[PDB]
Structures are given as structure tokens and as C-alpha cells.
Amino acid sequence: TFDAFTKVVAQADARGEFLSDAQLDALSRLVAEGNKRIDTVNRITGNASSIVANAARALFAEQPSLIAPGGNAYTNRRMAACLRDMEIILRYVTYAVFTGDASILDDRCLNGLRETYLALGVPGASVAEGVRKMKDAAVAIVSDRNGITQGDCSAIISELGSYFDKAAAAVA
Amino acid sequence: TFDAFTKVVAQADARGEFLSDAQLDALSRLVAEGNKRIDTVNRITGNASSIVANAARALFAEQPSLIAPGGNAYTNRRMAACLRDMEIILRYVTYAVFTGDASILDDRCLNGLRETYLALGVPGASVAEGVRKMKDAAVAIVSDRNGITQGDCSAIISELGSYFDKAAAAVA
Amino acid sequence: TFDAFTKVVAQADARGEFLSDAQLDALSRLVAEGNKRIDTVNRITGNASSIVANAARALFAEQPSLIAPGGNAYTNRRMAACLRDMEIILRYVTYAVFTGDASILDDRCLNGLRETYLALGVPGASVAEGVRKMKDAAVAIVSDRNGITQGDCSAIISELGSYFDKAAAAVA
Amino acid sequence: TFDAFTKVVAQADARGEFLSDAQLDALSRLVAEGNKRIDTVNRITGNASSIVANAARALFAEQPSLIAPGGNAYTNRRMAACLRDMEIILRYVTYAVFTGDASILDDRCLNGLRETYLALGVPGASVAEGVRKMKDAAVAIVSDRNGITQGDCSAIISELGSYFDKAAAAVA
Amino acid sequence: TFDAFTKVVAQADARGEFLSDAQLDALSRLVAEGNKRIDTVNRITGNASSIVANAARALFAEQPSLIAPGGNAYTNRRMAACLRDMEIILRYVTYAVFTGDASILDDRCLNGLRETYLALGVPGASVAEGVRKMKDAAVAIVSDRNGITQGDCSAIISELGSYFDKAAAAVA
Amino acid sequence: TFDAFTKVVAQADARGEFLSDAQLDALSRLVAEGNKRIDTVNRITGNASSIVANAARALFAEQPSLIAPGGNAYTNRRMAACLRDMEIILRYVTYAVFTGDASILDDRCLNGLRETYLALGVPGASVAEGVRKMKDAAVAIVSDRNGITQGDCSAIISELGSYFDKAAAAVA
Amino acid sequence: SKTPLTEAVAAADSQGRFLSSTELQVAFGRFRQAASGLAAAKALANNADSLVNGAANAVYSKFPYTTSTPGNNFASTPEGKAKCARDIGYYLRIVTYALVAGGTGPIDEYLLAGLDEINKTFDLAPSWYVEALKYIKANHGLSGDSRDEANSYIDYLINALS
Amino acid sequence: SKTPLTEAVAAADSQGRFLSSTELQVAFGRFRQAASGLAAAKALANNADSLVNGAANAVYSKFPYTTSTPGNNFASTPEGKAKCARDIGYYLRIVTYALVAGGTGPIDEYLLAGLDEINKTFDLAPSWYVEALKYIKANHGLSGDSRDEANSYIDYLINALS
Amino acid sequence: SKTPLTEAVAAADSQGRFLSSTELQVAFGRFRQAASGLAAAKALANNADSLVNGAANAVYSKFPYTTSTPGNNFASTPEGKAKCARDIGYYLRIVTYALVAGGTGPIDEYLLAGLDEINKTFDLAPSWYVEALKYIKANHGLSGDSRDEANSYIDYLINALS
Amino acid sequence: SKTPLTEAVAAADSQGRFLSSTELQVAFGRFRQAASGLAAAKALANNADSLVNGAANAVYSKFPYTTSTPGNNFASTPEGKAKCARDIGYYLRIVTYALVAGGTGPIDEYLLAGLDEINKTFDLAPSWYVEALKYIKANHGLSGDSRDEANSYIDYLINALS
Amino acid sequence: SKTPLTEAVAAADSQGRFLSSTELQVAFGRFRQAASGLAAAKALANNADSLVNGAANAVYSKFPYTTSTPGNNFASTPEGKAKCARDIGYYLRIVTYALVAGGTGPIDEYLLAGLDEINKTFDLAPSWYVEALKYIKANHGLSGDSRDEANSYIDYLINALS
Amino acid sequence: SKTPLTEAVAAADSQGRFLSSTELQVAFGRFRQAASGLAAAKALANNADSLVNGAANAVYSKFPYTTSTPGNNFASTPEGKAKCARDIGYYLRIVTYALVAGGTGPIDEYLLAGLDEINKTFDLAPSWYVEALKYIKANHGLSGDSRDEANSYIDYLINALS
Ligand SMILES: *C(C)[C@H]1/C(=C/c2[nH]c(/C=C3N=C(/C=C4\NC(=O)C(CC)=C4C)C(C)=C\3CCC(=O)O)c(CCC(=O)O)c2C)NC(=O)[C@@H]1C
């Protein structure tokens, strides 16, 4: 996988050149925004259990057929597995925010999930709705101003949002 | 794998229903025929080697090209593998009769066979004939009237024949 | 895998026949010149490092794109990897000359190599020329009349080449 | 491991001898009392969790140093472990009653356990008291006249007790 | 293993108590001298290879028996083994300074080492001498005033000293 | 392990000396007698099964208690284990003769054998008699002057017996 | 899943052996009890509606707060109570499968597996279900071997919820 | 060794599980069988003499070359027939052990393990033992359950020796 | 257990290498945080009585049935209250340890491992601890880096209980 | 299959190394043998009908019950005679192959692997073949290295047969 | 690709856990460094011509034989010097990447892995590169944290080359 | 100690097999060469003074700086020259062991294992030894088989040094 830093290094080494100032200044920006980045990771993690359960409750409420006898979430074993998947994706998204690159999420989580689901009969489109649920919840948690030093977090929130988007589209 | 019992159960919970009073009257019938089933398992088992041996002999006498130098069964290592294949099918077939469901026979033996023989170059059609000679032998061993309390056993014989036919058709 | 001897035995066994006099005269000729087969092997191995070093240097000199940044052999780790490949092909080729068979070369080295290289993005056609450069270097070293009892080693020289050629065609 | 049957067989084979009529009837007596043995296993198993739970509570209420900070069952993880050891000992004891022989308990559970505790720093003596607590509770359960066709289950009850004693003995 | 922090935490938990102010304000002083701890680790590490090579030399120059044929550091396989050992001890000693607790060096490195050298025949006293040379060489490296901001860093030098001493005493 | 040649070499390096002229000539004489050593290996090997079988019969004949029920040899499983031990020893013995050194025998066979027998309760003194009998049958087969070129292989015969004597002593 | 028949065959398979007199004795024990297992399954099924509603109420009385405190995981709303009743219906029905199979298999498949995560994630109290189970056991009306087998499955679950 | 009771516990132990209704069913299956299994062991034993000598002779008659040809593996000497009579006794004694244990375990333990390698190294024809077993099966005179299980073991050995 | 210092050496040791710039940074991060953590621990330690008893009352307040329902798992007796007061204090104390170590390490080691097993076995509702924890967080009175770190260990525990 | 050459290359390959003085000596040893091996292989081949028929009669002569006793496994019919003749011929041909390869490879692959399984199922006595092999050894009339080479394989099969 | 950021997630992932206070302190340490790290990267890159050309001369001056001795692996030809300069440039470039990443990762991945191999095959003396590295180190002009991190890498390579 | 005899047995042992014709051929190859290999060892040993001293001088000649440049790794002092002489002798002696053994065993064990690590740690140039080894090959005075076997070990070392 890559860092926001190793990502740039790679692109540069492919050309045998040092980093261009436009590349050095792009990273100095991510460094200065650092605290906001660290706050985003902690806020989602501190609420992970609620982000998952609530996002799951909504899903089943709008798609009852999932929990009707006949599954695919109907057994207790698969209901557990489904909850697990939601936790897994959310965990991998925080990894992306923490490193500042999607490689971690794409390379170890999303890659091959659309097909792994297809081969099992799990409704990938449903998983996409669950991921979107968590995105909104997570975004709102990150946007909350109560109990933090005020500032403009818009960049970090849009980046965060795109990772969730990648998770959705990867199984849509 | 499924038992005749758990097979019905799987059908019921997918539907989220108790077994129908009807479904229970069927299983009870298999239960009341329990002795006959135990006997057919015991009978074939006590004659495994000769079942294998005789079917093997007859098959080769009818298809000598399998025994000649360069035939599939020609060497000792492959003759052994050939006899082995024969007792495998027989053994799994007994497993099927004992549990009253073919799932053990399908998941653990047959499934994949046809393709395995293809890549290796084993005459599947010839295996099929061998298995059929085993069936004929087994059925007569099972229906012999001597030394056993008498009654109608026709139902377990055909249920036993179906397991042999499944194996037979899985190879060609 | 087979050696010149078991190869013939194989062709004879599938026919269920004793080796013909033509098969025996052929093998007994190979035995008679075994001394040349011994030297050829010792001469290649005796110059193993330089044959690979010099061929690799000429290979990069001819295709500098391979070592410039962004090239397949560009990094250090991959440079070591590419050299290893050069060493492994040579080792198996000597294996083939030693057994008097190519099966060790084909089964245990070349089979599936083209597929691996394509999957990794390793310029297979570039590997083929590196192999051809080793061939010429090895051929010349083996044909060298100095320090060895004089004679014509051309039958073995021709066999050595066929193995190098199989390697080149297999990676392309 | 042995059965109540196979334990007798081992004794007779060693001596090269058929089982005497005496040893044979001694076993038919055990067989005629199978139901009781079966009920004993079912009863303990039906109350397994409460057997363990209450004994742990009683043990701690009697030896508070156990759970005060710095004691062997303090912290969560030790405690869980301690609770598991109790369930394990009780599980294996039920295996002894079922097989009608102690070897399954001594072999797979008790042998080496004493040394296990010492290396760890676990107080065997108190682990021993815990076992005695489960015994009294299990014996009281097995000996309850409520809800069972009446009879004398005292041979099996002293039999149960012998295994609990073996467990307490192996621990200290 | 523990770090300076968890060590104190373990002693406090054993007594079901919060840290005192003596424990707290003591950990505060360590935190305050953290930059020095970090510089010492970096300095030893930055001269790892030369510290080992130079001490090894001095060792062999004063104790040539080790290097005479049939000596212990004699072959090339052992001599490499001996150098590695020197690097290992130094490596683990840097881990002790980094964590602020010796448990890492004792638990994973020094534990049972004397036993190990006894069964093999490795002159443990010479190993101890090699370590002492690494001590003196390392201390001088960390006490060097050039190239860093000046201050009294004799506290962590004493701590480093105790780790090196533990190492030497564990082999002697 | 060691070769007769690597045995002398190992000793030489420890002293850091070239082999003395006596050592080299001593090895030259072994090489010159190599044909006899080869025949010794082949004979015994062509006669292993009978050498083992006839040795066991003789042993049990003289010691019926080994076979009587309760005897160490009494079961089939263990009679099979006993036959195996005899083959193993004879086999490692031929290894000793083929390499001109006893290391293979003491290292992967005799080493700790006496002890595994005391733990299992296998009568070492009986095994020793067994090996003892395999020594004479072997000696007489190797000594047979028929179907071979005439010469005196007394040196090789004495060495062979020595390996046998060692195995018998490494137990009894 | 686990039953006398699958366990017997699986054990023979892992050993690469043909069935023998031991597995035959296993088969006799299963039929000697299938009759009363099925009968127990038929009776429970036929009395299901009163057993579930009766078990449901018993829990609402033992735990009044589950019906008078707003919470997604409580039954203080019409939908909540339906979820609880549905649940109690799952336990009962799954117990009838264990009786049909003659083993814990269907239970360990459809319910047990992941049962701990589910209760924790949804804040459902295991004691609620232990209570629903006891009411079911005290309202069986079952007798003989039919009672014992049914109870061994209920106590098995009660054990799993503690 | 393998018996209905040892297996049930071996399975539960490797699974780390308490016994449940399945193992109990297995216990009932065993105790249903034990009766006829013990009476069979008692009957075969009371008639050991007649059966061994009887079987031994059926082998010598179907294979006369074993009593007339010289060799360590044959019975052309008083000592030869002794080993043979002794062996048959072993086969029969071990069979009454399987009946006692209600499983092949004792056959597996004291006989079957290492049998082929014993017959090969000592050049004993497996067909000779097959013949002796056929005689025992045809002459023990047992009926019902005792016959069925006893023959289960005789045929197990026959299958093993072929 | 688990802290920035122990993980760094662990990763390095597993990879068989010397520490480098990456682990030094870890150490710089650890020391930037340490002062805050220790003062958080010092603060929580001094406010122990108030916090523990204030949290206990918050729990009994949210769930009145825990003080009025007969049972060994409840705080309906003075014996149960002392057990409940003790447990909460365990959490608070264990949390101050996390602050001293700068990681969940002491929480993992002394509390979290085995927690679920313990809560189920003794029938202790996890939500009960999820409230006391909310009380501690809403009343600790910590700000800045001390607030942020303390809350992560508290939210870490709340998440582990749901 | 096993031969000096394939074994050499296989060992070097396992250790991922180039051939050395050792493997070259193996080749010299091979080439020292191989002419003797091909000549013996050629000589036995040219004397096949005499060796096979002779060996067969040595068998029928030593075991007369094999030509007088009815059975799928006996040579009492002309077809049974055909099989025995063919089998003896199989051993003879596969032996010539080992002489060509200079190793037991072709014996291992074509005839030894599974040999015991075949003798058991089809009730063929290893002694019949041991006798056939002995006759062949006493009658091939081989000399020198050709004889010693050939006899190593005949004795290898004999040992494998007992 | 070893850095604080990738190691924190790798360890977190291998343990199947969400990030926590520990990895946060990791990030703080990373950001407390990145600025000086990136600055040192820009500075070194800005004076690459002097550093590199100034380094090659140090080597030739110290090891004059490299410029007078003929051979493929020496700098006594125009192309020999060209490659020696590129080689030094590679070292510097990759060190800047190490500074941009705040870890040895780019060094490990692009240079170190396979270095000894390359130096031995192409007969390049490790002490040549040590001299170059020492020249770069002494002609930094870098101060503080930029000087310290940049020197840990320069010394990291020197250690690897000795 | 990789040698024809030990390797053969190691292989047969790893397969649980007795030695056969293939291993026998290996022995023949071994003894058909040990005669010249042994005589070669004697000769190299008796010419040790001129070979070692001549090689050391050939090294100092092709690498003038090794006797001028001060440094622990160089021979600019008598101490350095003595060590170098010493070093050269080790190679020669270990090569005679290879001849006595008929394989690379002695080389691999006492010299080659850990070689690269040693030349690196003490900054010794592999080219130096490569050249000393060329001088040895030039000056053996060996011919035929003795020459060819010696040269294979000298080239085996040359390879390992490149
Ligand atoms: C000893 C602990 C106490 C006791 C035991 C006792 N039990 C029985 C008889 C039976 N027990 C069963 C048990 C089961 N049947 C089942 O289907 C299941 C579930 C799989 C179980 C656990 C059965 C079938 C019987 C026999 C039929 C019957 O109801 O009698 C007896 C009687 C005798 C006999 O040997 O059969 C006794 C004495 N009785 C006590 O008073 C002790 C406290």
C-alpha cells in the first residue's frame, strides 16, 4: 500500500526525478492540516459501534426482505457476518483517512468484493446502501462543532466522503 | 452435509415454518423402516472387497484395452488407483444409505470427479460401467432372503440403486 | 521428469515392448561420448557467474530502457531478481545437458513462465535475448579447444543449444 | 483411552484369555443400568453453566484474596480462564461417567495439570476446593427424585463422586 | 515486556491503587528528558556496524586463541555467528533504552543465553568482554558533545550502562 | 554426518593442517579396496528380508516369552514394530559400510535408542541378540566365495561386524 | 450440522473407513428415539401460538421495564413487541428442528452461531430469552422421552445464554 | 480403541463440547446391543475348542499342500499345526473382544494393525485365514442380533484379508 | 501490553532490525502526549470518590430495576451495591492506567480480555457499564489533550460493550 | 524415476545449486555401468521366451496346486495360464528397463508401486513370483557387471515380495 | 513502504483493530517531523549537482585506482565516471524520498533490497559508496531536525554497506 | 559436507530405502576418482610454500594500493601481510580438503558459509581472493583428472566470490 507521501515518491521515482515544488507544497498542506485529519479518525472510531448498528437498523427497516426467513441476513450467523462487513469497511475507511491514500482500502478490502458477494448470493447493492448510511452518519459526526477548536474542515470531510463512495461503488 | 432429517429442516426454516404434519408423517415412515436400512448398510459393507473385486474383474474381461500395455489401468500403480476409486464410490454410497441423503456422496466424492478424470485421461465411461456392475452385485446381496427376518424391502433397494446411478452418471 | 534412458523406457513401456535395437544403439552411443557431456556441463558451471554477468551487461547496454528509472530491471531489488532469473535458466539448462533430457528444464522451470512474466509485467521478449546471449557465451566456452583432449564435440554442442533455444521460446 | 468394556478386554488379552463368565456378567449388570448412567450425564449437562457459576461464586465468597486486586483470579482474563478450567473439568468428568472409565479424564485432562498450575503460579489447592463445590452441587442434582422414574442410582452416584475426587486430587 | 510506563502501572494494579505522585512526578521527569533518550538511541544505532566490527577486532587481538584454527570464531560460519551475536545484544540493548525498561532485553535476549553458550561450547566470558567493549565504545559515542545542543545527559548514560552490564553479566 | 574422507578432513581443519602423508595413503588404500566395499553393501542388501526374517524366528524360538501373550512381541502391531527395528538397524549398518564411517549409524539410529526402549519397556538385551544374529548371517553371506572374483576381503568383513557390534552394545 | 447420523458418517470419512457395528449401533439409538422426537415436534408446533404469546408475557412481567421504556431494543411499542414475539417464535421453531434431527445441529446452525454478537450489538438481554425458554419448558405438557429430549435442547440454549 | 462410547467422547472432545442428545442416543444404541454382544462372546468362548480345531481342519482340507510341503510357513510338522491352531485361536479370541466392546477397536488394536506385514514377512497366505473365518461363521450356530454382530466382525477381518 | 513504545520495539524486533527514524517519531509523538495523560490520570485519581459514586447513582437512576429486583447480579442489596461501586472503580482506575501508558494496553490486559465472558456468565448487563462510562466522560471536567485522550479510552470501552 | 542422473539433478535442484564435482562423479559412475546394463537388457530380451516359459514351469512345478485347483487366481485353465505367462513376462521386461535406466526407477513406477495391493485383491501369492525370479536368476547366463547389475534388481523384487 | 503511517495501519490491520490513541500519537510524531523532513528533501535536491559531483571526486581522490585501472567496473573511461555519478545520484535521490516519507521505506524498496547482490556481481566496492555518503553528510549545510533525520538515513546506508 | 557418499545415503535415508544400484554407481564414480583427487591434495600440500607466497605476491602486484594504503583491511603493515598470507593458506588447505572429500562439502562448511558477511564486515575485496585463486590454478602443475577436479573447486570459489 501507499502513504500520501510514499504515493508521491513512487510517481516521482518512476520518472527518476526529485519532487517538484508543486509536489512539495502539496504535502506541506496535508501536514499543516494534520490535526484535523487526526480528529476525523478518532471521531469515527469513537462512534464506530453506533455508526454500524444504526446504519444496519435502517437498512433492514427499508429492506425487510433481508431479514425475513430466507435470509440473506436472516440467519444469526449471517446477521453477524453482515454486521462484520459493515465494521470492516468502516475500519478500512478510517485507515484511508489516517494514511491519506485509498490504496489501503482498495488493495485489502474492496478488491474482489463485488465478485466474492456474487459467488455467495449476498446482495451487493444492499451493502452499498449500508455503506452510504455510515457515510452520512460519519460525515455528520465529523462535522459536529461541539467540543473542538473551531475551524474549516471541509477538505478532510470531502476526502473522507470519497473513500466511502469508493466503498459503495466497489460493490454497487 | 444433510441427513434425511436435517434435509427437511433446511427446507422448513428457509420458509420460516414448522415441519408440516405431513412432512412429519414421511420421516416417521423412514424411521419405522430403520431396520431394513441398517441391514442394507451392513450387508454391502460385509461384502465390500468381493463387490470391488468381481466388478473389477468383469470390467476388464469386457474391456481388455484397459488392461493392455498402455491402457489406463495397465500399470500396477494405476490398477491400484483404479481399484481404490471403485471402493471409494462404494464406501460413499453406503454413507448415503446410512444418512438417507445423497449430499455426502455429492459433496465429498462425485463432485469434481468428471473434470478430474478429464485432465488425467481416465475413461469416465469405463468407470461408470464398473460402478454399475457394483450396483447389480450389491442389490442382489441386499435382496437375498436367506438368514434374515423376511418382509418387503423394495423401497430401500431402489433408494440404494438411485445412489449408485448418481455416481455412475457423474463419471460419464 | 526423465533422463535420456528413462525417456526411451517410457516410449517402450507404453507399447509393452522390449527396447528395439535402434533404441539401444542410440543410447549406447550417448554412453560412449559421455565424457564430452561431462566436460560441457563442468565448463558451463565453471563459468556460471561471468556468463550471466557479461550477458546481463550486454543486455542492458543494448536496451538501456530496462535500467533507466521506470524500467523493469531498474531497481535494485528487481536487478537482483533479473540476475537470479538469468542464473536459474542457466542452471536448468545444465540440468538438461546432464540428464540428456529437457523435461527437468521444461517441467521445473519453463512451464508457466511466460504467464508469470506477463502477469508481473516482466518484458518476456527481453528475457529471451538475455538467454540467447548466455547461449552464445556458453557455446563458445564449450567449443574452446584449449586445455582439453582434442576431438569433435559438436553433437553435444548442438544439444546444448536446443536447450537454450527452448528457454528463449518459452519466456517470449 | 478405555471404555468400561475395553478396559476389561485389555486385561484379558494381556493374559491371552477369553473373558470369564464372571467378568462378562459384571458387564451385563452395567448395561442393565445404562439408563441411570445416561440420566446422570444429561443431568449434569443440563445444569453445566449454573454448576460452574455457583461454585465459582461460593469459592470467591470463601476466599476473597482470590479476587481482590493482585490475586490469581483478579482481572478479567484470569477469571474467565478460571471459569473455563471449571467447565473443562466438569466436561471431562461427564465423559468419564459416559465411557464408564476414568482414563478419558486422567489422560486428556488431569495428567500434567498439577505441573501446569505451578509453572503459572495458579493455586491448585483452591482450584481443588472449586472442584469439590461442583461435585456437591452435581451430586445433589443427580440425586434429586423430582421428575424421574424412581430407582436406586447410588452405584452410579458413588461412581460420579470418584471422578470428582480424582480431579480434586490431580489439581493440588 | 513493559515500558517505563506500564512497569509502574503493573506495580500499582497489583495493589488496586492509582499511581502516587512520586510515581507520577517521576514519570514526568523521564518524559522531560525524552529528547535525550531519543538521541542516545539514534547515536548507538547510527554507529551499529562500526561498534560491532571494532569491538570484535579488539576482542580477537587480545584473545587470538579464538581465531586460531580450531577456535571458536575460527570458521567463517561461526565468525559470522559471533558477529551476529554482537549485533543482536547491541540491538536489544537499544530497545531497552527506547522503552525505558530492561524487560525486553532480559525476556527475549539474555534469558537462557548462558545455558545456550554452555551446550554449544561458546566461550561466554569472551562474549562478555566483547560486550564491555561495545559499552565503552557506545558510551563515548553518546557522550560526544559535537553536533548536538548541549546539556547534562548523564542520567540516560547511566541507564544505558546498566543494560550493557546486564548483558555482560548474563553470559559471564 | 561424516564420510570416511570427511572424517579425516574435519580432524585436519581443527588443527589447521593439511592431511599428513600417512592419512592420505591410508585413504588411498581404502579407495583401492573400494570394489570389495561395494560388493559388501550389495550382498547384504540383496539378502535383507531373509536376514531379518530368519533372525527374528531364531530369536523368538530361543525366547518364547517375547511372543507369548503379554509379550513385548505379542501383538501384531508390535511384532511389526519389532521386525521394523531389525530392518532399520541392518539398513543403517549398510549405510555405515557404504560411507566407511559409523556416524550415520550413531547419529540417526543408535543415538538415544537405549533410552526409548527403557521408556517403552522393550527388552534391549533381546534386540541385541537379534542384531547379534543378523551379524553372523550377514558375515556368512558376504564371506561366500561363489559367483565372484577371488580375493581377501577380511578387512571389510571385520569392519562390517564392528558396526553390528556397536548397534548391539548401543542397546543391551 | 450435528446429529447422530452425520457425526457417525463424518467420523468414518475422516478415518477413510467403511461403516461398522459401532455406527450401526448409533443408527439403532437414533430410530429408537426419532418416534418420540417427532411426536414432541408435532405437539410443540401445534401449541405454538399460546406458547410464544405466553412466553412473551412472562418476560414482560419478569421485566416490566422492557415494555415501559422507549428504546430500539425494547418492546414499549407495537413493533417492538412484534419483534420480541417473532424472536421467541424463532427459538421454539428451531427447537422443533432439533427434535426432528435428533441433535443440536439445527440449533447450532440457525441460532447459536453468532448468537452472542447479535445480543450484544442489539442490546438484547440474554436473561429475557432464558425466561422465555423456561416458560416454554414449564408449559410443554410433554411427557416421557419426548420431554427429556425437548428439555435437553432448551437447557442447552439456556446454558448458551449464560 | 473404536467403540460407540469412545468415539462419541473423542468427537465431543476434539470439538470441545459437552455431550448432548446425540451422544445419549448413541449410548442407548450401545446398551441395546451389549446384551446380545455379550451372550455371543460367552457362546463362542464356550465352544473355542471345537471351532479352532474345526476351522484349522477346513484349511488343511481346502489347502492340502500346507500339511504336506516342507517349510517354516506351513503346517507339515506338529509345530507347524501348533502355530496354525494358535493363530486361529487368536482370531477367535479377538472377535469375542469386539463383541464385548461392541466395536472393531480390539480387532484394530491387537490384530489388524500390522497384519499384512506379518502375513508378508512370514509368508502366510491370507486366503488360509479367510477359510478359517468362513468355517467359524458357518459353524458358531448363533442367531438374531448375536449372529449379526458376530458376523459383522468375521466379515470385517475377511475384507481386511482380501 | 500495547503502547507506542512497546509496539515500535515489537514491530522492529519481529522484523529483526534496529530502530530507525520511524520509531523515533513514534517516540516523539509519545512524549508530546505523555504530560497530558499523566495530569489526566492525576485528576481522575483525585476525583475518584465523586466520580465512582456519582456514576453508580447515574446507573441506578437510569435503571431503577437494578436496585429493586432480587438477585445476585443486581444491586438490590448492600452487597450488590458495594460490588457495583467496586466495578465502576475498577473501570476508572484501569482508565487512569491507559492514560499513564498512552495506550489501551492496561485496559486490554486487566479489563477488556475476558470482559464479554464475564458479563454473560455473571449476567451483568453491558449497558449498565455503558452509562457509568457516559457519566465519567460527562463529568470528569477534563479539557484539551487530556480531554481528548481520556475520552478515547472511555469511548474505546463503550464501543467494546456494544 | 530413480536413476543416478535424475537423482543427482533432483538433489541439486532441492538445494537450488549448480552441479559440482560430486554430480559429475555420479555421471562417471553411470557411464561406467551403462554399457553393461544395455548389453544385459539386450541379452535378456533375446532370451525372453525361454526365460518366461522356463520360469512359469518352475512355478507350476513348485506349486502344483496352482494348475490343478479351480479359481480366478489359479493357472488351471488356459487363460489362467495366459495371465501367469504374461505376468512373468511383465517382470522380465520391467527388469530390462531398469538395466537401461541404471536404476530401480522403472521397477518402482511401473510395477512396485501398488504391487502389494494387487497381490492381495487378486489373491496372487508373492511366493509364485519369488520362484519365477529365482529361476530367471539361475538361467539368464549373465556375466560380470551385467550379472551383478541384473541380479541387484531381481533380488530387489524378491525382497519387495517378502 | 515502511513509514509511521503505514506501520501503524499494518499493525492495526494484522490485529484486526481500529486505530486508537497509540497510532494517533504516531501521527502527531509524523507531522511534528514532516515539515523539516520535506524541507531537507527540497534543500538536498536543490544542490544535487554539487553534492553528487563533489561526492564522486571524494571517491576518486580517496581511491585513485578507480580512475587509472582498466575494467568494466571502474571509472577510468568516460562511461565509467558517468555511471559512478548516476549511482551517487540514485543514493541522494532515494534519501530525499526517505525524507519525504519520514521512513526508510523508499530506501529499503528502491536501493537496499538487493544491494549486496549488485555490488558483488558488478564488482563495486562498498567502501566507495561509504566515502560518497560521508562526503554528502559533511557537506549538508543542513541543521537541526532536518540534519538529524537526513543523517539517520545516510548512516543507515553506511551501516548496510559495512 | 556435500560428497558423493554422504549425499547418496542422505537421499536413500530420506526415503527410508536401502542402498541400490544407483547408489552403487555413485560409489564407483567416487572411487574411480578419489585416486587422482587424493594425489592432487598431496601435491598441492607439498607446494604450499610457493603457491601461497606466489599468490600473495600476485595479489599485491595487481592491487598495489593494498600494500601502500593504511588501514586495518589492508596489508600495508607486516600484521596485514601476515593475515593476508594466512587467508591465502586457508583457501588452499580447504581446497585440498575438497579434493580429499571428492566434493564441495569442506569448502561450503569451513569457508563459504558466512563468507560474504566476513568480507563485508572487514571490508576485504573479493577480487583480491579471486586473483589469488587464479594464481593457484595457473601454478598447480596438475594434469588430467587431478587438474580438472582441482580447477572445479577453484572455479567454484571464484564463482562464490562473484
Ligand atoms: C439417578 C441419577 C436417578 C434415577 C434414574 C433412573 N432413570 C431411569 C430410566 C430412564 N431414563 C431415561 C432417560 C432419557 N430418556 C430419554 O429419551 C432422554 C433424552 C435423550 C433421557 C435422558 C429413560 C428412557 C429411562 C427408561 C424408561 C423409563 O422412563 O423408565 C430409571 C429406571 C430404569 C431403567 O434402568 O430403566 C432410573 C432408576 N432415578 C432416580 O430416582 C435417581 C434420582
Curated annotation (Swiss-Prot), chains A, B, C, D, E, F:
**Any one annotated GO CC term:** phycobilisome
Q: Does the keyword Membrane apply?
A: yes
- InterPro entries, A to Z: Globin-like_sf, Phycobilisome_asu/bsu, Phycobilisome_asu/bsu_sf, Phycocyanin_b
Q: What is its main location?
A: membrane
* Stored CDD domains: PC_PEC_beta
Q: Where does (2R,3E)-phycocyanobilin 1 bind?
A: 82
- What is an example of a Pfam family matching this protein? Phycobilisome
Provide one Gene Ontology biological process annotation: photosynthesis
| Recorded superkingdom | Bacteria
Where (2R,3E)-phycocyanobilin 2 is bound, by residue?
Answer: 153
Instruction: Give UniProt keywords alphabetically.
Output: Antenna complex, Bile pigment, Chromophore, Electron transport, Membrane, Methylation, Photosynthesis, Phycobilisome, Thylakoid, Transport
Where are residues bearing N4-methylasparagine located in the sequence?
A: 72
The post-translation modification note in this UniProt entry reads: Contains two covalently linked bilin chromophores.
User: What does this protein's UniProt record list under function?
Assistant: Light-harvesting photosynthetic bile pigment-protein from the phycobiliprotein complex (phycobilisome, PBS). Phycocyanin is the major phycobiliprotein in the PBS rod.
**PANTHER family (UniProt xref):** C-PHYCOCYANIN BETA SUBUNIT, PHYCOBILISOME 32.1 KDA LINKER POLYPEPTIDE, PHYCOCYANIN-ASSOCIATED, ROD 2-RELATED
Q: Quaternary arrangement and interactors, per the entry?
A: Heterodimer of an alpha and a beta subunit, which further assembles into trimers and the trimers into hexamers.
Q: Which family does it belong to?
A: Belongs to the phycobiliprotein family.
Name used for this protein in its record = C-phycocyanin beta subunit
Gene assigned in the entry: cpcB1
From Swiss-Prot, chains G, H, I, J, K, L:
Keyword tags:
Antenna complex, Bile pigment, Chromophore, Electron transport, Membrane, Photosynthesis, Phycobilisome, Thylakoid, Transport
Q: Which Pfam families match?
A: Phycobilisome
Q: Which GO terms describe its biological process?
A: photosynthesis
In terms of domain of life, where is this protein from? Bacteria
Q: Where in the cell is it found?
A: Cellular thylakoid membrane
Major site of localization recorded for this protein: membrane
InterPro entries recorded: Globin-like_sf, Phycobilisome_asu/bsu, Phycobilisome_asu/bsu_sf, Phycocyanin_a
**Entry keyword annotation includes Coiled coil:** no
Q: Which GO terms describe its cellular component?
A: phycobilisome; plasma membrane-derived thylakoid membrane
Sites where the protein binds (2R,3E)-phycocyanobilin:
84
Q: Got any disulfides in this one, which pairs?
A: none
Lipid bilayer topology = Peripheral membrane protein
What the entry says about post-translational processing? Contains one covalently linked phycocyanobilin chromophore.
Describe the task this protein carries out: Light-harvesting photosynthetic bile pigment-protein from the phycobiliprotein complex (phycobilisome, PBS). Phycocyanin is the major phycobiliprotein in the PBS rod.
Per UniProt, subunit arrangement is: Heterodimer of an alpha and a beta subunit, which further assembles into trimers and the trimers into hexamers.
- To which protein family does this belong? Belongs to the phycobiliprotein family.
Name this polypeptide is given: C-phycocyanin alpha subunit
Q: Which species is listed as the source?
A: Synechococcus elongatus (strain ATCC 33912 / PCC 7942 / FACHB-805)
> Which gene name does the record give?
cpcA1
